[PDB]
Design a binder for these strands. Sequence first.
RNA 1: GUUUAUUAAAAACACAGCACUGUGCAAACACGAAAGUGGACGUAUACGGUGUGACGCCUGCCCGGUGCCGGAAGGUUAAU
RNA 2: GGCGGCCCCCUGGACGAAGACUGACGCUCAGGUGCGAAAGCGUGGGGAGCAAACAGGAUUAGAUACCCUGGUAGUCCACGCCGUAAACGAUGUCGACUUGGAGGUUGUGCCCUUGAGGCGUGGCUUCCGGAGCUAACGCGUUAAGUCGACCGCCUGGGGAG
Lengths: 100, 117, 51, 55, 267
Amino acid sequence: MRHYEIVFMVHPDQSEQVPGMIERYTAAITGAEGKIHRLEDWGRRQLAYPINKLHKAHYVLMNVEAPQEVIDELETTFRFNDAVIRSMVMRTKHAVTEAS
Amino acid sequence: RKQVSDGVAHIHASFNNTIVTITDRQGNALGWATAGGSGFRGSRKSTPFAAQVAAERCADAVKEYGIKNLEVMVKGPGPGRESTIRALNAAGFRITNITDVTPIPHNGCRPPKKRRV
Amino acid sequence: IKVRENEPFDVALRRFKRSCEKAGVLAEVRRREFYEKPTTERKRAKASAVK
Amino acid sequence: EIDYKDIATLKNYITESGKIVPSRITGTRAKYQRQLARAIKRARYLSLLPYTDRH
Amino acid sequence: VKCKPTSPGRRHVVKVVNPELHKGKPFAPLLEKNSKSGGRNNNGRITTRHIGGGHKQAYRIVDFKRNKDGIPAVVERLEYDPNRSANIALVLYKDGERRYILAPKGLKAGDQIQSGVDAAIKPGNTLPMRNIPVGSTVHNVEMKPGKGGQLARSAGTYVQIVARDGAYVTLRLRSGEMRKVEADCRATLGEVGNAEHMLRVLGKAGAARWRGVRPTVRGTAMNPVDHPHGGGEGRNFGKHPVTPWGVQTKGKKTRSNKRTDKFIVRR
RNA sequence: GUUUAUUAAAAACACAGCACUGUGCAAACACGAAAGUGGACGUAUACGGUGUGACGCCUGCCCGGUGCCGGAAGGUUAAU
RNA sequence: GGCGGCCCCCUGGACGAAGACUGACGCUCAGGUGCGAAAGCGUGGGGAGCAAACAGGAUUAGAUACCCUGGUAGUCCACGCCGUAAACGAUGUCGACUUGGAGGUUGUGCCCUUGAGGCGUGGCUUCCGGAGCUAACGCGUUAAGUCGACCGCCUGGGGAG
């Protein structure tokens, strides 16, 4: 229940794939019985560097009260996903529940 | 003979020489010249008079490709940092940007040590 | 590190990048770096500056 | 100032070279500055504090 | 030899410190499904493969193809094979059958053996590389995509799946890493079973090269009735190549079918 | 050791590691005119060159010449 | 010694505290136990960029050279005989030492927290203060001036590591 602040970057224009693909990431968190403090559609925002060439991403952030048994599974199912630009995980010093 | 309007000026400033290298708005060659190869080849070819003459002599050729304005791309400076910029603009090619991306280069690649010098 | 000039009569507004990135980055690196002996030297210099 | 909603209002402490200025200029208490330092860190790596001009 | 169990040679108390000392990998009888290898060279007639001495080949492990994919299985034993130094093991499949498989270092527990199109990523019989992740270890490789195992043995030859290379044309291996063969080939995972039997000398001799054969021992030295050299008096001293065919570098290949090697940096 | 019974009876040396080497595989070798049988029920840590001289250190150096070949900037000047 | 981003696991040391429970189970150590900067042995390699050797063009009173392109080893190390030299209060074990006063920092008790910290107060660290002690630089109580438990080293040139 570590309070994993996790930002993941998917492919920019797949606005119809992603609403369900968050359901295909949260599905690992509920399994754990772990729980979502915040969960943010950051949208088609631009990039700091030229990664995976379409100069934007579809950014998603969440703050999960979820155990260590999920995070190497999450890391895997972001990484094995050819639609995932980059993905990163911060944790603890309380929870965030306020949007960005 | 190209009517590109836009050029991209790789100003090799430099520590030993001066080569003002214009590519097009896409990335292939367009026009160029130098100090050392224009009549100077030795311990005398990077000088603030030479670095301005390199740019002016690059401009005498570059004119034929139909090109009015440019950016400046810095990826290896030296004597003199602003001299080759002023000298393309003097010779009428408008400097609308300076892109100072220049690789230092940073610690771990540790560039040539040479004589203690 | 990207900086316009406008109307470009060779304006020379390009000048403010001396603050660090263009100009300060040569403290370590020139041909060659310093390699040995620059680490306690940074804090040695703090004592020459008390004036 | 430990967390997000306040550091989007405190970008005044970024000097023009794109870096966080030494507090000599206002004079803050150590606890509060050392809080804001970690609020800034999470906003750096998450690009919610988008550090210097081109990024 | 730095792994465990390493099994070291004895103290200097006898002429044989090595060979291999491993307990727990010879068993009997030679179990129902088996066969042997035949006589001496007998090619018909003037034999071209030198020195011979060809008795006792002897028995070999009859399991090739190994295409039994998604029927799950479990592990009784592991053995040896002296033809390949290998870590070969007894795999009971839960339809109603026993096989002999080319398994890695300690694949027993009796474990969770199962393979195939999409169904598993586990320890797995023969597994299509197009269906599964990237990795260092691969082993089997059906040498062209329906033929059979390129490697019949787990002797350290790490053949390595690269990711998105050239439309499915993977592997990063030994003598030519642009071998370029399709991920429609089958893996098993993986290439380290018995390091120990091959990371050290077995002997000077041991049974592997005197009870049933002779190896090479001569070609150039003695009697000029063979090689291009060299008079006698212990002198030789000349220019003597491997005629008509060459030796210490030249290459031999021009054309052939497949012939996919593409860069082959040599040395 | 019983090894070239037949000059020596070893004062021959068959070991066995290995850098390089033959082949990305109808793999090298082809005995036979047609086998594809050795190697294979097998992969370049299987199998072959040319050898190795317990074991463990140790293999400085030195490219003038001649090997080994491998190449392509360019001249000698053939089928084409 | 010695690592520079952050994290999952084994979760070092600690060490700020309402206390509970036992009453010196203690300190400090030689032979040994672990650790062990430079280096050799590796056994198989992971085989950028730079640069000893490697290889020369060059500056030639000889360069057997330093350049400058090209150049490995050093980068680091699974694993383990590693002694070992510059890791100096030229210096352990420490309790009592209570003129002190000044900073640099860390945690924290108490304030109409109108406050730049006021009244406090240990720890981590440095500053550098009498009576003495005393050459000359000045060191001035935790510091060499008192008092001490030892596991020590200390046998003069040159004989030696």
